[PDB]
């Protein structure tokens, strides 16, 4: 084959030993007595350095198998920055779900009612877009990592103002950079969702189930799509050190034990840095399932069985100009077999909030053609965004 090393770049081999060491029963004469190099004397051979007392920073890194949690079985870990090739298909396969186009009827009918709209909804959202992209920064062209979390927080505040009309939104509270872990066995291989999230919203009361029993029964006959050349594991991180313990982000007795919404933000200036929309939806599927699986096992037990009371977890993905919406319902814990009841997940893809924005007035032939402000606006994207926030109430 063609090994990728290069002789010059690789570390050179140690120089050949002097001929004196090859003569049996002959003590070589070295310069180690004078502790400095001298020509004409044999090069000493020293034993490997053995510091009597270990020092934390300056010691060599311990071997991986020395860690107590090291295990022979190879477990696969999915953190934030893992990319899946068949994002919709791989996430569906690893989770044993069924993709249903469109938001559920409860969510969609919760936004079409005019009695659930903020005052001047069209005007305030228009200012929120302008504030996020042009007003929030002193620079003329704010970078994406500045206006990606601003636009999401601005829209959260708009739907947070509805607490006066619905005095039940006070049961929600936000959490930041929590440690989440959920391990399950999926067809003789071990998977684990470990890492953190951008923003998390929790509510005191659990979210009611959203899928009718007719659809659950129809899910049994559904067959998961498969891809032969690509193994389902591709895109994950193979870790030999892990702990089989589903650990959520909070300890026992937390007054908000029911997660409600997950907010994933792809904030990065460079195009290759950010997730593709197909891969971004995969990121939401697993993390929404990871939070759902943690509750399904904490509230019922480690035993694998079908859940009589489903757990519903929502999540919203944002690019700064394009939005992704996901509502996931968990029904099955015994994921080893593929013949039981599958889960459900409603996904709306590429909900474009606005087409383009002009930070500076474009001038063609000494006249103004398009003034400052967003070009094109679709209020339904925010209307669905408002629907998810008010789903609990």
């Amino acid at each position: 084959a063609y090994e990728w090393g290069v002789r010059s770049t690789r570390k050179p081999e140690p120089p050949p030993l002097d001929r004196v060491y090859e003569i049996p029963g002959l003590e070589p004469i070295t310069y180690a007595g004078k502790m400095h190099f001298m020509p004409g004397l044999a090069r000493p051979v020293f034993p490997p350095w053995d510091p009597g007392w270990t020092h934390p920073k300056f010691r060599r890194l311990p071997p991986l198998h020395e860690h107590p949690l090291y295990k022979d079985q190879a477990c696969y870990v999915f953190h934030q920055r893992c990319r899946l090739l068949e994002g919709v298909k791989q996430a569906l396969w690893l989770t044993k779900t069924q993709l249903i186009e469109g938001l559920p009827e409860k969510v969609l009918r919760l936004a079409d009612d005019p009695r659930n709209h903020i005052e001047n909804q069209d005007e305030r959202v228009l200012n929120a877009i302008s504030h996020a992209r042009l007003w929030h920064s002193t620079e003329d062209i704010p970078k994406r990592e500045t206006y990606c979390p601003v636009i999401v927080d601005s829209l959260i505040q708009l739907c947070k103002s509805q607490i006066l009309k619905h005095p039940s939104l006070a049961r929600r509270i936000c959490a930041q950079n929590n440690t989440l872990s959920a391990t399950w066995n999926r067809e003789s291989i071990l998977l684990q969702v470990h890492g953190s999230s951008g923003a998390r919203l929790n509510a005191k009361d659990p979210l009611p189930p959203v899928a009718s029993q007719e659809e659950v029964e129809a899910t049994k006959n559904h067959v998961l799509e498969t891809f032969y050349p690509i193994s389902p594991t591709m895109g994950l991180q193979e870790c030999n050190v892990y702990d089989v313990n589903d650990d959520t982000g909070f300890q026992e007795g937390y007054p908000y034990p029911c997660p409600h919404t997950l907010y994933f933000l792809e904030s990065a200036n460079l195009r290759p840095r950010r997730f593709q929309p197909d891969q971004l939806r995969a990121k939401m599927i697993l993390f929404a399932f990871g939070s759902a699986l943690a509750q399904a096992r904490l509230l019922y037990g480690n035993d694998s069985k079908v859940l009589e009371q489903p757990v519903v977890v929502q999540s919203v993905g944002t690019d700064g100009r394009l939005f992704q919406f996901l509502v996931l319902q968990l029904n099955t814990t015994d994921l080893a077999s593929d013949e039981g009841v599958k889960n459900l997940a409603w996904v709306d893809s590429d909900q474009l909030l606005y087409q383009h924005f002009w930070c500076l007035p474009v001038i063609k032939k000494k006249v103004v053609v398009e003034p400052v402000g967003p070009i094109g606006f679709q209020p339904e994207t925010f209307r669905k965004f408002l629907a998810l926030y008010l789903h609990g109430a």
């Binding site: 084959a1 990728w4 290069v6 010059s8 770049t9 891809f227 050349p229 193994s231």
Partner: protein, 240 residues
């Protein structure tokens, strides 16, 4: 002063790697090859020449992979295509009509009768039909592809005698090689690379070629149309 070559990466990775130009200067620092330097900055893609390479040695059987996308490689004159299978991805040279969402089979099982030749499949020279166009020729078993990799270059298998295959290189020179070497069926992508026309002197500078020297050298005896018989067949088979 001795310099360090930028080819220091040890582990294969599909992502592009940083690349430093040379400009014709050797490690000493003197010009050895003229007319090279001052080109546009480029990144290098790790190309896996060995078509047959199982993920693990537990299952040495033939495996089939899927093509994801076909990209443009600044280094070589051909087009490389991303190929994924199992738990790894590879950059291999794309044939004439390789597109996205295509399946490629890699095999080494030398069957007695035959194997149907597809546009992307890689089979040992012992199983291919006599009249087959091939590229990425492996000179010795396990060495890897070295020959026939430019854009639009395709060699044709000639005959298989006493368990040994003879191929025709693009230079119209016959080459003898053991039939167990892996080869790829088809013609290399970007067929019209020869028909490309450079519109201005600046485009040569963008590619990275410096202008020739202005010294006027009188032609010697080497010049003139030379008619020479074809050299004998080059054989890599070691006769015991």
């Amino acid at each position: 002063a001795t310099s360090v070559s930028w080819k220091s990466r040890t582990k294969y990775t599909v992502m592009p790697v940083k690349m430093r130009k040379s400009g014709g200067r050797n490690h000493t620092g003197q010009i050895q090859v003229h007319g090279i330097g001052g080109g546009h900055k480029q990144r290098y893609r790790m190309i896996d020449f060995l078509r047959f390479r199982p993920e693990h040695e537990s299952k040495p059987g033939p495996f089939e992979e899927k093509v994801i996308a076909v990209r443009y490689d600044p280094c070589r004159s051909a087009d490389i295509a991303l190929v994924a299978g199992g738990n790894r991805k590879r950059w291999i040279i794309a044939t004439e009509n390789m597109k996205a969402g295509d399946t490629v089979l890699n095999s080494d099982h030398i069957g007695r009768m035959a194997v149907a030749a597809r546009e992307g499949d890689a089979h040992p020279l012992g199983a291919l039909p006599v009249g087959t166009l091939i590229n990425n020729v492996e000179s010795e078993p396990g060495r890897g592809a070295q020959y026939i990799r430019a854009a639009g270059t395709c060699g044709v298998l000639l005959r298989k005698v006493n368990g040994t295959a003879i191929i025709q290189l693009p230079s119209k020179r016959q080459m003898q090689v053991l039939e167990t070497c892996i080869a790829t069926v088809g013609r290399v992508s970007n067929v019209d690379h020869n028909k490309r026309v450079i519109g201005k002197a600046g485009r040569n500078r963008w590619l990275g070629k410096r202008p020739n020297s202005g010294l006027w050298q009188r032609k010697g005896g080497w010049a003139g149309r030379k008619i020479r018989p074809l050299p004998p067949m080059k054989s890599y088979v070691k006769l015991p």
